[PDB]
Design a protein around this ligand. Sequence first.
Ligand code: SF4
Length: 753
Amino acid sequence: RAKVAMSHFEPHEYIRYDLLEKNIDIVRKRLNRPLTLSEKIVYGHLDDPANQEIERGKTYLRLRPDRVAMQDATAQMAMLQFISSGLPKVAVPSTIHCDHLIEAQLGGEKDLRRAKDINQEVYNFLATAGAKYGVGFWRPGSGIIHQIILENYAYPGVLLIGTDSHTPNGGGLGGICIGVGGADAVDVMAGIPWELKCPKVIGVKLTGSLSGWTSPKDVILKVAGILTVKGGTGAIVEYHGPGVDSISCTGMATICNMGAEIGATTSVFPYNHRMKKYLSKTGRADIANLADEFKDHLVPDPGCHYDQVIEINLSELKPHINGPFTPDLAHPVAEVGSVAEKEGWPLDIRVGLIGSCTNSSYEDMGRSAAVAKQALAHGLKCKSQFTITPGSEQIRATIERDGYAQVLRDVGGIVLANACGPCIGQWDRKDIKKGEKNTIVTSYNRNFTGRNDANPETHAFVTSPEIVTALAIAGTLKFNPETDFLTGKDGKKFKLEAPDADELPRAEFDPGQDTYQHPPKDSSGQRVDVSPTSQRLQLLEPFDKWDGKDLEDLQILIKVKGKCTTDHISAAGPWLKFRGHLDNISNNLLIGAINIENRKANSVRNAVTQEFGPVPDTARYYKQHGIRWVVIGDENYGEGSSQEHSALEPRHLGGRAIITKSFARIHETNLKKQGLLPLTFADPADYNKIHPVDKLTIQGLKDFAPGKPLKCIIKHPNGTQETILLNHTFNETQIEWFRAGSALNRMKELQQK
Ligand code: SF4
């Protein structure tokens, strides 16, 4: 049949739409119903389509991903696990992207130069580990993992896994793209099936079309606000309706990206002519013509069943701005000034930030450059400090060329490197003292406490790039671009017109500089060397096998109250220096969670010494004194970033299990990967029966079975004991992960010795 390749860097690796169509037909004959598109791509990729038991919300799917993509903050450890597996070459297409370790201070050239001095040990390690296991290396300066995947590797019907929670961006080009932790990526690179819990499916029906100030961003600001951060847990959001053609391929990618802030497994859009056009503009018109031929299998069946259906009329949608401490608190731009005032949100905006992978496209930058030029033409500049982060070299080279970059500098913006930077908090922020109370509006996705500048008093809002620009000219939340009047140099009160710009370059894309390095697959005789005195990289030492015993009299390290996001468990910013080193990064364990006893961060009672201390130190105390421990947590524990570190570091410091009312998807899978026991209250009111002082015995591990709950005895100080039941989502593939001590230890017992 056709021999069309996956990318311009893997020409011998062919797109298998012929497989997709065979597995779809087998599955559809067993189910006898319409399949949604996500169902066609996910079941179309099953390892065993004829025997795979399929229940939405219940079964685990043995799947076969087409490719793996890692960024450098989650990549080092993924490769440290791959090294430990013993295997010689990765088994599917795989890439590493250096975007995460590049700190914004001075602006792109210098910053990029500095970060290459500063992170030389890591980048070198990644490029050598790549050269060796046959993994593609995109160099520091290339771009952000999600912009490079959409411009180069995402296509209709790909199943892609990425070690990042914002991998769902790829659903803008019609594939199923799921964020995972470095251990799920090791399965796939090692050739062992990847298991996913069969998604439920939220249908969003889009109607009418966008105009003027309204953009893509607003559509998911609106959905985020309607579903709340836990509304899409265990579900894919499938967009459909006549309104989908009205949105560019770029914007469909924005909507899918931020579907991660409502915890969705991923998001997907149906292949359509705005994607055809994008594939052709980015050198892939052959994939586009091959996808016209399989179009049927790349769009939903007639009459397919959504578990939930939300209708969004695009034509009535208003600009929004979400926040400031969660992405699901939505306001129409029109009302946020009035609300800010009412709440003590600092109305004056200190920094406007535009870019990141959620919103640094050619169309996003043109829409921003078109608000910027109207200010300039009346002699203005930003009241607010203004930074621009292009999502790729290709976008920095083309907007530069088509003259957008210039306009953004003339209004006073600084063009940062094509790197995450301020989005992840790699930002040497100096315009505020720590704990100063300020506002910043971003075109980003996540705005949770102190994410961008580590200052917990920063009120960070997320809106769209053209809104960030218009409000950065105002320097106030008190400015609605639709109604209000600016004042030029000329003494004249003007209004700002709605931006219209080209979705794609008139000419084609200017690729920029040399940033890729393909694996020499001739040599591969690189020694990937880890200096044993390195503070950045350390080889993993395997975890203990399970002792065959019940986990008796466990100590509660912390009983967490409210929101305990991954970044509370393992913080980023300055800690990203240690993502290759398990011991020095363990020093950030749970320092950001609030303790229910005293309601502080990083202050828990040591049980022995009765002094209140830091959580890492206290867990290291219990480990050094043989005290096995547990974390009691509330709802949607582990929400956020996909980083497996939130699960390696508790296991490192003697953690045994984490009991919560609910878990976020990725985090729960990482805790199981690492031999820890993720569990949930059979009744969430039981959380109230546990106080910090009690000891807990998890009873029944010997006949740990799927669907069978576990017994937990609460041993109170006073000889009283309650038994509660704890549910778990294990299956027997995962119970062997527990028994072996971790997934990787299990994999190495399967390796014959
Ligand atoms: S830190 Fe921000 S710019 Fe980087 S991949 Fe995540 S969402 Fe995108």
